[PDB]
Amino acid sequence: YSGPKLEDGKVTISFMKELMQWYKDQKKLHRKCAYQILVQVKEVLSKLSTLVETTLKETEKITVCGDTHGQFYDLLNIFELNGLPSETNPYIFNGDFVDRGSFSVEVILTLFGFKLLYPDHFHLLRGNHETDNMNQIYGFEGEVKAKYTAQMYELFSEVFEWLPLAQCINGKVLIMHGGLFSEDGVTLDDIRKIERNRQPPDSGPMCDLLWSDPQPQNGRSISKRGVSCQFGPDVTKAFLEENNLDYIIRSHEVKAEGYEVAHGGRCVTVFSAPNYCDQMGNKASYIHLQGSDLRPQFHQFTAVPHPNVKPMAYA
Ligand SMILES: [Zn+2]
Ligand SMILES: [Zn+2]
């Protein structure tokens, strides 16, 4: 074992360059590194508020990316185009880091490693795929079982379960993975007190954040996906008013250009797993907001080569 190693059991920027090289080259991080970072981040994440509140001062900027779902080479591509994470190049990854892609283990531990390395500048928000269920069917678990063991999987699970549900910036812009609410009158003070450390329930607010979609016509519909709902432009506009917000960024659904703006400006979708599943031809992008004009700028990019492992391989 000549693989990458923690200095003084604790992640560092050159461990990370190192993990990235190692992972580019399809090798495995050693179990006990895997294990250390997972326990460390359980720790970090777990004293985090369910609702993350961050402040971009006038001259800072932060990048917000959505699904990446195991397309690790395209993750590295993100970093090459936009820079490494660092205290001056902060990231939010709005969930779905795992599943479907065949380099989810690569994704997630790169992800947790930067979390460990830049805790107040590198943000992870829970997807609906950071959950046991999606995990048993779309590939994560098979993947972990194949490269480590069940044990290492349950540890992952326990970790995910501490992932914040949503993050607001300058009490102007709020980001979650899925969307807004099945019921009205939900406030930021509500999201804060969601006791998040569980598999999501069937319904209630924590379901929604993880699961709902926008629709174009005013109102709410049952979600074509079996859980939560589609909320209309009224729903969004109602919630922005109660809470005093400018608009929301969310992910969850693929997009032929890698973003959409729905709801009249009010509800933005970024999605950062290009040519999602080696199939859909799509563009991805990510978003730069900066401290003095929190308006989205959208940066497109498209999928690079990755090695010949098939989507879904581990399910
Ligand atoms: Zn999703
Ligand atoms: Zn997704």
Q: Which of 125, 91, 135 is nearest to 250 (CA)?
A: 125
Give distance in angstroms: CA of 240 to centre of ligand 1. 22
> How many CA atoms are closer than 13 Å to the CA of 205, on its beta-carbon side?
17
Residue 276, amino acid: Y
**Is residue 111 within 8 Å of residue 124, measured between CB atoms?**
yes
Separation of alpha carbons 128 and 97, rounded Å:
10
Helix (H, G, I), strand (E, B) or coil at 260: strand
DSSP readout, 129-161?
A: SSSHHHHHHHSHHHHHHHHS-HHHHHHHHHHHT
Resolution (A): 2.6
H or E segment and range at residue 34? helix 31-46
Q: Which ligand is nearest to the CA of 210?
A: 1
Separation of alpha carbons 17 and 252, rounded Å:
29
Separation of alpha carbons 194 and 180, rounded Å:
14
**Is residue 77 within 8 Å of residue 106, measured between CB atoms?**
no
Say whether 129 is catalytic.
Answer: yes
Give distance in angstroms: CA of 219 to centre of ligand 1. 22
> Experimentally, how was this structure solved?
X-ray
Residue 21, amino acid: Q
Q: Active site residue: 30, 121, 123, 129, which one?
A: 129
Separation of alpha carbons 120 and 32, rounded Å:
25
Q: Is 190 annotated as a binding residue?
A: no
Q: Which ligand is nearest to the CA of 272?
A: 2
Q: Is 100 annotated as a binding residue?
A: yes
Separation of alpha carbons 180 and 267, rounded Å:
10
What structural domains does the chain harbor? 1-315 (3.60.21.10)
Q: Is 246 annotated as a binding residue?
A: no
Give distance in angstroms: CA of 186 to centre of ligand 1. 21
DSSP state of 265: G
Dig out the tokens for 266 from the structure. 């009010």
Q: Which of 167, 193, 184, 170 is nearest to 250 (CA)?
A: 167
**Bridging pattern class, strands 267-270 and 247-250:** parallel
- What values do phi and psi take at 299, rounded to 5? -115, 110
Separation of alpha carbons 236 and 166, rounded Å:
16
Q: Which of 62, 283, 293 is nearest to 175 (CA)?
A: 62
